[PDB]
Symmetry: C3
Subunit: 262 residues, 3 copies
Amino acid sequence: DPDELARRAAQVIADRTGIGEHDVAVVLGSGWLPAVAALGSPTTVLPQAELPGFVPPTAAGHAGELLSVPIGAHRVLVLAGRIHAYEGHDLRYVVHPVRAARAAGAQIMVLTNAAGGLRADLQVGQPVLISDHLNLTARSPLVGGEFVDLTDAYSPRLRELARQSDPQLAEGVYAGLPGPHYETPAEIRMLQTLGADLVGMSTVHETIAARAAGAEVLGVSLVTNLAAGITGEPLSHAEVLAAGAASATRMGALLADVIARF
Amino acid sequence: DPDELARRAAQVIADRTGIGEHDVAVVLGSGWLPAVAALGSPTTVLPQAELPGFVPPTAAGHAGELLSVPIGAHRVLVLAGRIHAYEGHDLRYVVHPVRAARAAGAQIMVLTNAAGGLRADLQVGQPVLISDHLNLTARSPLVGGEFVDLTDAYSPRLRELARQSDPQLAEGVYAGLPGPHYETPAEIRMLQTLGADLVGMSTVHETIAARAAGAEVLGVSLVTNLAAGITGEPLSHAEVLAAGAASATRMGALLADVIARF
Amino acid sequence: DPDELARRAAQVIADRTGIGEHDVAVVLGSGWLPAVAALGSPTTVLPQAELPGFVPPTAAGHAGELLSVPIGAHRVLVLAGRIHAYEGHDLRYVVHPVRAARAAGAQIMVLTNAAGGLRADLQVGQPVLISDHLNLTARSPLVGGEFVDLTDAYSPRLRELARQSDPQLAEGVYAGLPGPHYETPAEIRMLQTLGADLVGMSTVHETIAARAAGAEVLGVSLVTNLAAGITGEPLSHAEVLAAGAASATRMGALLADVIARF
Ligand SMILES: O=c1[nH]cnc2c([C@@H]3N[C@H](CO)[C@@H](O)[C@H]3O)c[nH]c12
Ligand SMILES: O=c1[nH]cnc2c([C@@H]3N[C@H](CO)[C@@H](O)[C@H]3O)c[nH]c12
Ligand SMILES: O=c1[nH]cnc2c([C@@H]3N[C@H](CO)[C@@H](O)[C@H]3O)c[nH]c12
């Protein structure tokens, strides 16, 4: 049972951090690892692996740590690193971190990720607020008759607050695919036709799980590379991490400021 | 063995109803539960759970009953409620009811469902004949080299008969998704681009199985809500059932008049 | 570990053929079985089933044999027949033949298949070079952080060589679907919108695996039928095999000549 597992994880989080309840949770994706320090001074740092139900992250660029950080008037859970469906894990494990965070009191989830940019106006290193998503995985983290509405899955209010921190922030539709292979140029052209502005291999299930659990979501993609076929240059995860590092300072500052506005 | 399991179920149906063979089968979807009265008076009513191979439905609004009803010159098998892929069962179980009906003698399957309306003309409460479908589940109920043709999956002949009952019935293409989460507005815009007029989380596999088993199919979607993002109002299953209830008498009467024409 | 299984198979292949290493591998798809003769005189012919990791092909038209044939200056592994995801096997098995071929020394994979034609200028019996693909299976043969780039998945260089053999060769985008049911006309219209020129139920995963393993790929689809809904006539696998047979002489001559140019 996902709920009981989440509660057990939340209890351990409370016991180890000494904080009975957190207010916000942030998941740092590929390329975002170095932005963790700017969020603030952690009062607790521990391995995600220690927590019940947490499959340790294994992808390059994911620290696999959980930090408790005070940001503004909030106590924030920072999930440095995440796991993905392409790693072979049942979605119950993929969305467990968000569910555990919710069980720990977090009613706002800030989901960040590295994405390929499909819209012509997007440049490498640019942060893009996720306005909506396209779940192209043919899967759902929900089982049974859990008919969750996804109309304002990415809270307009939170995107407005982000815009208050930095007015220049653009928005875009994120397409979530299975992965782990990158897309072919033809698939990218297809995604453009489908209305996608960004492409990645995560986030969508976590967003669905968050909404199902009653939490709001702010999604932020860092354009770590132009989508396959745009430049013709081959994609590389190492380069994705490098591109993310170049914007780490701005990203950390952005997250710290926006969260404090919540 | 799917076929043998279907034969066993068909035998129990014959013994329990006292009817050696049925001619038509109707699967009542979400919101269609109370349409049974308008179909006619059952001569036998029994729990699906008591039939070999039948996984009991669990979604709200699905009774999980089987009724034998005389409609016109036909002996009709009415499956009040269905199971869906989002409930986690292998497709063999999802399409078993249709295969059991075929084994019971039904050469015509009337598959009804609750669907979100995407096309501009559609209104809540409007019945729509399924002209074709878009299987967007990345799955198939068929295994191995069962290369079944789906050119006229939804019999033009049956749609013609349906229009004799109600000349104003409109047609539309049904998009079948995994579920159980409702679609995001972006996904709905994507489906419109793909050619979808209706969207649901069932039916496609049942239609495929019916075709593979030599049965004709008449699909009827009841627009229980406008697709996500159309009205901007959040979708709700309880509201889907309420919408269905408001049109149940009309739907039952429609089904009765159409089936009598078979 | 797929790589270890691949090496083991490669060792058995070397022992059984008396050839320490092969240079090119060709997978003959549906309808291509009779094209074998034109490739040359095999020095060894053995059942795929007798090789480690090879799940025996079962689809009609797939011989399930492995032949070592000298073509031009190359020692070629000819895989007469393949397995498909619709047969229910884990993708590790679906791409094993290609990985085994790579482990045996093949740095070039010629993947042939039978496909439905969507583009108006394509005719039944026409061979079409695959310029790119659309993986619409919601799956990948890769696991974990295998972030493989698919920018030039179908080697432009190899397509140029094929063109030297037959200058009139057309190119097109191949859409890979789960199968085994054929597409509905509405689905075909959708595929056209997505940019597909050809449609089939194989190849994409093999191409991805080949790329991840460092081999170039030349994809050749034989239009064995026009896509569902184009003619209005139902599709049939037996007819697909018949269409393939009608072009077998041309296909075999094409393959023999192109491979000699590698
Ligand atoms: O262009 C892209 N396509 C698909 N995924 C990604 C990503 C994300 N980064 C990781 C691969 O580098 C993977 O976890 C994926 O979700 C960055 N750029 C792209
Ligand atoms: O807008 C919609 N999108 C997807 N499914 C449905 C449905 C059908 N009704 C059920 C959810 O209420 C579910 O089984 C689904 O198949 C009604 N409206 C919609
Ligand atoms: O029109 C078509 N649609 C989908 N697959 C195929 C095929 C290929 N041939 C086989 C079915 O005949 C199957 O393995 C599929 O990959 C030929 N024509 C079509």
